[model samples]
Target chain A: SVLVTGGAGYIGSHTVLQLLEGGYSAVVVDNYDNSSAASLQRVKKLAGENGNRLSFHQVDLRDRPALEKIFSETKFDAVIHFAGLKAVGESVEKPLLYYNNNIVGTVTLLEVMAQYGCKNLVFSSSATVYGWPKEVPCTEESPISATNPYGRTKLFIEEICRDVHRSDSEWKIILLRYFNPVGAHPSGYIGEDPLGVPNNLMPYVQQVAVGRRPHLTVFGTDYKTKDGTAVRDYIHVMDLADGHIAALRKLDDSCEVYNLGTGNGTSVLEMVAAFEKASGKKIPLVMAGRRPGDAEVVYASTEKAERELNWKAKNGIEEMCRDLWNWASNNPYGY
Target chain B: MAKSVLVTGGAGYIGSHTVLQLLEGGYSAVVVDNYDNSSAASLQRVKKLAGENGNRLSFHQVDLRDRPALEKIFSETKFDAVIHFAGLKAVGESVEKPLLYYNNNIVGTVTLLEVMAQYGCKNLVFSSSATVYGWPKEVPCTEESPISATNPYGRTKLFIEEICRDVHRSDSEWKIILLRYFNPVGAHPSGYIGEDPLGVPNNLMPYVQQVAVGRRPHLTVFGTDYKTKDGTAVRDYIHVMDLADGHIAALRKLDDLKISCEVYNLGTGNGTSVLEMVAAFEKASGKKIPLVMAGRRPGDAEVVYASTEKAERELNWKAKNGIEEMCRDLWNWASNNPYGY
Candidate 1:
């Protein structure tokens, strides 16, 4: 059985769905700090054809005793770490909370996993580690920096993973540095459901489509880009989930880092147009001043994930928007 | 009613020395030590050495990770400022156990910072090391030297420095001083308190002390072929007392409300080769020092020394003692206590 932490959150539930369909048992643990149990229920419903091969526990990664108990009860072949706070602005607001939750939580999780002899880990890193790349198409070899606490946590955890792997040669660690994971599972049963204000472009766009929000507030304009707006690489969450399967299959007795992205950049206006075209709804845009620290253009060089893990992001922007609109329209109010 | 300062890792070598200096400087010192790589006897010795003035020196054996224990100390003691030093410092051990290093250093500091912020203790003097300037590209390292680390232990220092900067950035009330110390060696002249390591020594001074006292067979020099004249690694080794007084200078700087955060290189601005340090110990003890040159350590820098001008200009402090005094005090402590306290 595989331990999927944060299995009830956005891309996590989708990855768990694929894991179940891929014929591997998964044991998910989530503190539900920013997620819900209904997502897990939907995931199991979607995986109904597969027997009860998935189990979940309500536990925080920072709680060692509870995590140790879970590890003792389960025989995990590997762990997929998706537990962390991921809002850029909120992380800046409370840096210590981000450090404690993300950094401290990951440390305890790694310790418990080490104690349980589950040395294989597939961590969910972020493109934020690139921290305003000097150039476009950020490759795996790009020098990492952290413009804010959120990105710093990712960078710090990446360093910790490297040092951990160096300390123990037997560890099989695969750090999947994802760009921007948009869209959701195409099943229309599971999708992105933010608790408070949606942080990402798609969720906010979807919220506007469903009438939850009256409009989408673009954070920046006048950036030195094609459309004078920020650009980011958006990958389909399903594609991201499938990459985890590739990662687990390609795991060996060494640490490997891969960028799981579409190797494509889409401007903010392009994303809004795609969502509008996909959802057939007008997203009223308010062009605000340029947000501080927003990268002009951020994308990925996905050659590593493709060449090494034998994985590729098959879905494009239209597919991502179609899937996101599909789930957001059906839920109206997300479960 | 003296000014109270909380000193973390007060049982460790530099921490104990800094605590002693704080007490003598007319500040009530509350020592919070885990004693993982230290002993309580150091503080008892400080008391014995200080005599009546030592009444202001109190200690609590607590790890920085123990939140409740640390919080209890903060609740009980109203500290004007805090001197933080508790951390795992071994390079090889850190390489062997990276998690322990990160857990002890990063996580422990985060917890301590959170407690300090909650308790409204904004002023801090952190114990930084020259390791943050890992493999300096040039000698006479300055405070603004490009920062990097060759090992996990050094990385912790770099990370903590960055974390401290972030903390200060988040809140302007924090008056922090990062004293980037060069290699600190030597004991108190009184011979009453000094480094008494439990296991095999990791540092050059303690290892040399052990060899001088015959606790170890001989010294294994890690490098031989370097660009230096002596074909050995060189470092700016300062006396422990000088380094201790640097902390006091940093505290005094914090006493004045001017700078939000600053860094100072506390060293003698002089480089001492491994062979030269061995010779100093030999001259101090009047004993024959044996040496075996091994292959150059993988991460050993050819020359690493500091520019003492920064602290002299900022803290009005300069390293006065020389290698002779360093070895003399080290030998005194080693010969008196052949076995560690």
Candidate 2:
């Protein structure tokens, strides 16, 4: 069995779903600060008998006594850490909030894991650590840095993990630097349910296509890119979920880092075009000024993941939009 | 009335000396220390050295990580500013115990900041280190020198410097000054207080003092093959009293209103090689200092010093004592108290 932090968020819920479908058990802990319990209730209905393999506790990662009690009850072989505040803009405005919640929270979790001897961890890092690479196709070996507070949190946490592993070779850790995660599960049962308005391109486009909002505002158009739109590697959400399992299985008594992306660059216009084609709606765009700190191009080199974990993204852009539209149309008001 | 100051780690070496300096400056100084590396006896000496003004000295035994206990210290008094120096400073031990260092340093600083914010304490003078330079590419480091860390202890200092900036950025009310101190040596002129490492000394002056007082055997010079005047590494050693006075200058500068957050390197802008320091110690202590040559250890830097122009110009403070005074005062503490309080 494994322990999952932030197990009710977008990628987290799908990871639990994938775990249960594979006949593995999990113990999920979440503060539910940015999620609803209804997502898990629906997850239980989707997994059938395997759904019973999951248990949950609503607790913050910083709550030491509560987390200690949970660890005493369940013996988890590994821990999949997905809990953190990820909004890039809010992070700049409230850096202390991000540092305390994300950095301190991870420190507390690592302390608890060390105390209990659960040495394996699959951490959810971000490609933002690459931070405006001087060139394209950023591999795991790319020079790492941070352009914002949110990115700094990821970079620092990755550094801390490396130090921890170096201090003790007994600890097995994998830091998964995920690129842009888009789309949803085919069931439309579990999808990205961002608390307020969504921050990324796909959800905004999906909302516009489903009439939940008006026209989508593309953040930049003057960037030097194909079609004058910034490009990103938008991997399917379920593909990210499967990547977690692959990392979990591939854990060893050493620290490793892998870039989890589809290795394909899809531009903002390209993604909007695909979403419109899949949703069969005219999603108009309102061009806006360039967002500061927005990179011109961001994509991952997935050779490390494929060469090591043997896991490759199967779903392409069209399937990604179809599943996304499936969820957007099904629940215009998210659970 | 003088400003009321809360000197965290006030019972420790530099903290205790600062407390005395504050009392001497007609200011009230309160101390809260875990005593993991210090003793109440140092504050008692500060009290003795201050005479009647020692009545202004207050002491509390509370770890910085103990939020409620630390907050209670703030609730009891309205502090004008905080001089923070509490941290684990052993670089070698930090590499072996990274988690303990991070938890103590980072967690302690975060908790202290939270409590200070709750109490409306906006002025802070943080005791950063020249180790943040992490093997400077050149000598005489200014505040503009890029910061890096070679060990967990230095990393904690660098991380706290960043955290202080972020906190100040989030709120405009904060007045923060980061004093990047080089090697701090010497004791108060009265010889009432000085650095007292609990275990074996990890620094040059303390270990040199120990060897002088017969507390330890001959000192092992780490490397004599480095590219220096005497093929030994060099550092800018500052006096503890002068470093303490820098805090006072920084506290007064908090009211300047021109700068909200700042960083200054506190050093004598001079590099003293190990052989020179050793000869100076022998001259002051009147003892033959035996030394053993050892190969260069990994990660040991050849030369590191500070540019004191910023602190002198902005804080109106500079290292006023030279290496001879540093040795004289260190010998006073070593010969008088032999074993540190």
Candidate 3:
């Protein structure tokens, strides 16, 4: 059985859903600091049709003894790590907290997993490791520099994983650097529910759609792009979840690193227009000055994931907006 | 009231010597050591040297990474400052076990700083090395020289020093003093406390003393054709007791400056060759020493000393002792305590 840390959160819960549907037994361990315990109840309700093969434990990655206890109870075939603090602006102000929670937490988890002889890991990396991509549609081989502490945490953990695998030849590590994941599952029972202020664009848009916020504040409208605004690659969360399954299938080989992104670069205006078109609801926009450290264009090349994992983004922007609207509209107060 | 100062790795060689100085300076010193490479007998020697073991000097047998235990110690005592000396220092062994060095040296320092910050005690005196100035372009290296590490051990120190600087920048209240020490030799004047290397000595003074005391065979002098007066690798070896005094001097600077991160080269400003150190030890102990010339060891610089102007001008601290004094004191200690306590 595969063990998933932070498996009740955004990308994590979606991946756990797919892992269960694919006839694989899964166990989720979440600290619930950034997520809700109620989300696990929703997961259980959805996974009941699959013979209830999914189990969960409330555990933090930093709690070694607690994690070891969970590991002792369960024989995990692989671990998919998704536990991290991902807010860029907050990371700059509280670098130590981010470093401790993200980098040190990952190291501690790795140490425990090594002690338990669980050598397989699928790390949740990000394209932010490639800060201010030099070229449009950045590839897996793009040059990397972390502009903020959040990105640095991802880059540092990737380095740690590489060193760990090199130190021992038996480790099977796959680093999946994801692009913008922007939608919920098709069932609409599970969805992205962020605590506090929503950090990403789609979540903020969803909050605006649900009338949680009066209006959406677009960071910038005058950029060097064709739309005169920032642009990014938005992929369906289910597509990203499917990519994890593909990674698990190929884990029998040596460790690998892949970039999981759609090749298309969707502009902020394009995404807003798509959401408006899909939901048939107007998104009030306020054009403001450019946000600090906001790149004109940020997207990724899906060549590696497509070639290696045989995974592609099947749903387009319409499906992304429709699914997010369905989930956000149904569960205004997300469970 | 004496300020409580936490000395990590206080059971080790330089740490024990510094603990003696701290106690003699009337500061309440508490040591946290795992005793990985040191023995409890060294603490007994420190106690004997200090003359009183009750409240002035205390030790906790705890690793730096044990957060709960470290936090408990910090909670029990209001530490005014921390002198971090806990780390793996062997260069060759570091290459064989880089993970151990990274985890013990880098991660351990981070954890200690985290706990210290939680306790609101941010002043630190880090034990840096001249190895950070890897293969200097000049004879007497200064603090501004280009820094790099030739081995994993040195890399750990350099990385942690960077982390300290970043931490200070992130919070200006942090007062950090990076003491880049050259070769530190000799023991306390009482001869009761000195460097007790576990296995073979990686430094010149201890090896020379061991050879003088007949614990080892002849000294293996590497590269007798270097560009120097005696055609041997030269280093500025300072007495360990004097080095401990430098820590006190650096701590004194924290009172004057608001928030400071200062780097001082702690050395005698005089380079003595390996052959010269061996001959000086023989002269000091009246023992003949035999030496065999060997090929140059990898990662060994030809000659490295310090300018010491920063220490002199800023801290008003200069190396008062010389090579002869170093050799005399080391020989006396080795001969007196042949088995290293």
Identify the leading candidate in terms of lDDT: 1
After TM-score superposition, the amount by which residue A123's alpha carbon in candidate 2 deviates from its true location, in angstroms, is 1.4
Better of 1 and 3 by lDDT: 1
Q: Residue pairs in steric clash, candidate 2?
A: none
Tens-digit per-residue lDDT, A1-335, candidate 2: 99999998888999999999988898989998888788888887899999889888898998889999989998889999999998776776677777778877888899899999998999999988998889779999988876767887888788788878877887899999999999888988778887777767777787787777899898789888878888899999899999998898898427899999998998999999998889888998999986645677999898989999998999999999999988888887878
lDDT of 3 by residue, B21-69 (tens): 8887888899999988788888787787777643588888999989899
Which one is best on DockQ?
1
Tell me what TM-score chain A of model 3 achieves.
Answer: 0.96
Question: Which of the two, 1 or 2, has more TM-score?
Answer: 1
lDDT of each: 0.88, 0.87, 0.83
Residue pairs in steric clash, candidate 1? Answer: none
| DockQ winner between candidates 2 and 3 | 2
Candidate 3 pairs with clashing backbones: none
Model 1 B-chain TM: 0.98
Per-model TM-score on C-alpha atoms: 0.97, 0.93, 0.81
Computed on C-alpha atoms, the DockQ of candidate 1 is 0.65
